[PDB]
Symmetry: C4
Subunit: 38 residues, 4 copies
Amino acid sequence: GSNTIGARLNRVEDKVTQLDQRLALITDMLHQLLSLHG
Amino acid sequence: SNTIGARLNRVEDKVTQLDQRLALITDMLHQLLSLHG
Amino acid sequence: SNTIGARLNRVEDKVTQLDQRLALITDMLHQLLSLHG
Amino acid sequence: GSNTIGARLNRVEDKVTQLDQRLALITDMLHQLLSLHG
Ligand code: NI
């Protein structure tokens, strides 16, 4: 629980996973931008 | 400042900052996409 | 798989993956900037 | 040394710092792109 080493690492891992999903979405937006230029 | 608890709270803070950056980058990309049509 | 060592090696691996993504995003942005002139 | 909990956390913190610097550079590139469109 919000204090514990295991809990902190759990939050960190979840957050990093969320960063990865946002970066996949950012990459997709960039693909769209590149494709719409030709 | 070199304890496990101290290191972990810096890492969590920095990862949170990274998410803030990601939200701004996402907004900028929405602006760019919409500006193109 | 729930040990501190196991958690930390997943976190380090994921953070490394994030850097790979960042390098690709950077390349794409260089392409876009240069395509504009 | 590459094994230790403190060492692993040191690598993780350094890497996250590097991610932050890359994301600042990405943001700058996006600012340039937006500005060159008007
Ligand atoms: Ni354009």
